Design a protein around this ligand. Structure first.
Ligand SMILES: OC[C@H](CC1CCCC1)Nc1ncnc2[nH]ccc12
Length: 167
């Protein structure tokens, strides 16, 4: 039993809700919140900009130190950093950004990072401003993640389409 509320169950391990991931994280304080990161951990917009804003820029400060030490992530890769006031940990995961020409096949590799954590609150990787088809992202999520994932979909209209089209 966990404290996630109001989710529709899609499969044995995947759940979905129309929600602002920032507000969800502040309520649940999950062990792991997933950020839709880029390789530079520059949290400018989308989920990343919103999460970072909610941390009063502490996420960005921590991220800049991480990059200065370690260099950029790989597309499809991840790192674990602090969750600040939102969660115990933040798993920064880089899905391919179609608006940069990156290979959509890397989306499966990106979701594989979720399997290192028993339970996660997460967005749909590569959706939104990353330019991929969210229906496809949900399909890859369900077919790749084996741990318990609670997906927050910000856009209500998109949420309804994802549910109604789910196979
Ligand atoms: O990339 C996933 C998603 C893409 C868009 C959301 C609506 C239409 C497409 N972004 C978000 N998902 C959940 N909570 C969020 N809070 C701020 C941003 C955000």
């Amino acid at each position: 039993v966990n404290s996630f509320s109001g989710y529709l169950k899609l499969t044995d391990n995947v759940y979905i809700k129309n929600a602002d991931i920032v507000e969800e994280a502040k309520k649940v304080k999950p062990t792991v919140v997933v950020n839709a990161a880029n390789v530079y951990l520059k949290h400018g917009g989308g989920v990343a900009g919103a999460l970072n804003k909610a941390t009063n820029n502490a996420m960005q400060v921590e991220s800049d130190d991480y990059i200065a030490t370690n260099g950029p992530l790989k597309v499809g890769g991840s790192c674990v950093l602090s969750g600040h006031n939102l969660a115990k940990h933040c798993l920064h995961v880089v899905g391919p950004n179609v608006n940069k020409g990156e290979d959509i096949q890397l989306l499966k590799s990106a979701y594989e990072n979720f399997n290192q954590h028993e339970v996660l609150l997460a967005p749909l990787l590569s959706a939104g401003i990353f330019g991929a088809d969210p229906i496809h992202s949900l399909r890859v999520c369900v077919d790749t993640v084996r741990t318990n994932v609670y997906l927050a979909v910000f856009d209500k209209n998109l949420y309804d389409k994802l549910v109604s089209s789910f196979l």
